[PDB]
Design a protein around this nucleic acid. Structure first.
Ligand SMILES: [Mn+2]
Ligand SMILES: [Mn+2]
Ligand SMILES: [Mn+2]
Ligand SMILES: [Mn+2]
Length: 175
DNA sequence: GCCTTGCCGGGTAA
DNA sequence: CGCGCCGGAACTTAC
DNA sequence: GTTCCGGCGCG
DNA sequence: CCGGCAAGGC
């Protein structure tokens, strides 16, 4: 119940700023990766990491939270077939999220992909379907919004949250 | 004259 | 033999 | 954000 | 993602 909320949030960080990777190496080795990337050293070590750790403990995943420093970004990485299938199986069921999970996921996605100036309230992604699902969630939460193709260079869509519901959006989802 | 939201280009944080 | 956890990091582009 | 590399370890 | 701009509704 409370793992599901933290799970939906992390999944928001993952879909937005990360990935679920099933790799086949030379040969025939394999690896399963759960990844969140972020520029802010602080956000990843003091906020995201401890949340991933709770989840890991709670699932008895005996893998380690790895934090790899790259030049443009920090990468939080858990190398684990179990955690991989945990998030992937949850992603499969995204349409069945309850309110707690919807809210947590949107918060995760916004932290990852959102307009963080909060001047406007916007979310970016190539995945129109994902944005459509979030859009319905926002509507049933009283947050009006529209989706259109924003960047023709890269087929990136944007979900714009109406400034008319700025407050309902900011306190319900982001807080 | 003001507010909201679609348009679109730059380049950094994915 | 086939397969799953570490530790980087070069590489491209979607935010 | 994605996928290479060479490492070690399992039965 | 950011952020200037302008079309258009009030
Ligand atoms: Mn993304
Ligand atoms: Mn992103
Ligand atoms: Mn236990
Ligand atoms: Mn981000």
């Amino acid at each position: 119940e409370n793992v599901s909320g933290i799970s939906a949030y992390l999944l928001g960080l993952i879909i937005g700023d990360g990935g679920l990777y099933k790799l086949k190496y030379k040969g025939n080795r394999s690896e399963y990766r759960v990844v969140i990337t972020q520029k802010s050293e602080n956000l990843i070590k003091q906020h995201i990491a401890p949340l991933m750790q709770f989840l890991i403990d709670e699932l008895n995943v005996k893998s380690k939270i790895q934090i790899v420093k790259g030049d443009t970004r920090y990468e939080l990485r858990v190398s684990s077939k179990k955690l991989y299938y945990y998030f992937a199986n949850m992603l499969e069921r995204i349409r069945l999220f309850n309110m707690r999970e919807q809210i947590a996921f949107i918060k995760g996605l916004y932290v990852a992909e959102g307009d963080k100036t909060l001047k406007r309230l916007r979310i970016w992604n190539k995945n129109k379907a994902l944005l459509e699902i979030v859009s319905r969630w926002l509507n049933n939460l009283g947050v009006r919004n529209t989706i259109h193709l924003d960047d023709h260079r890269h087929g990136v869509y944007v979900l714009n949250i109406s400034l008319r519901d700025r407050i309902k959006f900011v306190h319900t989802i982001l807080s």
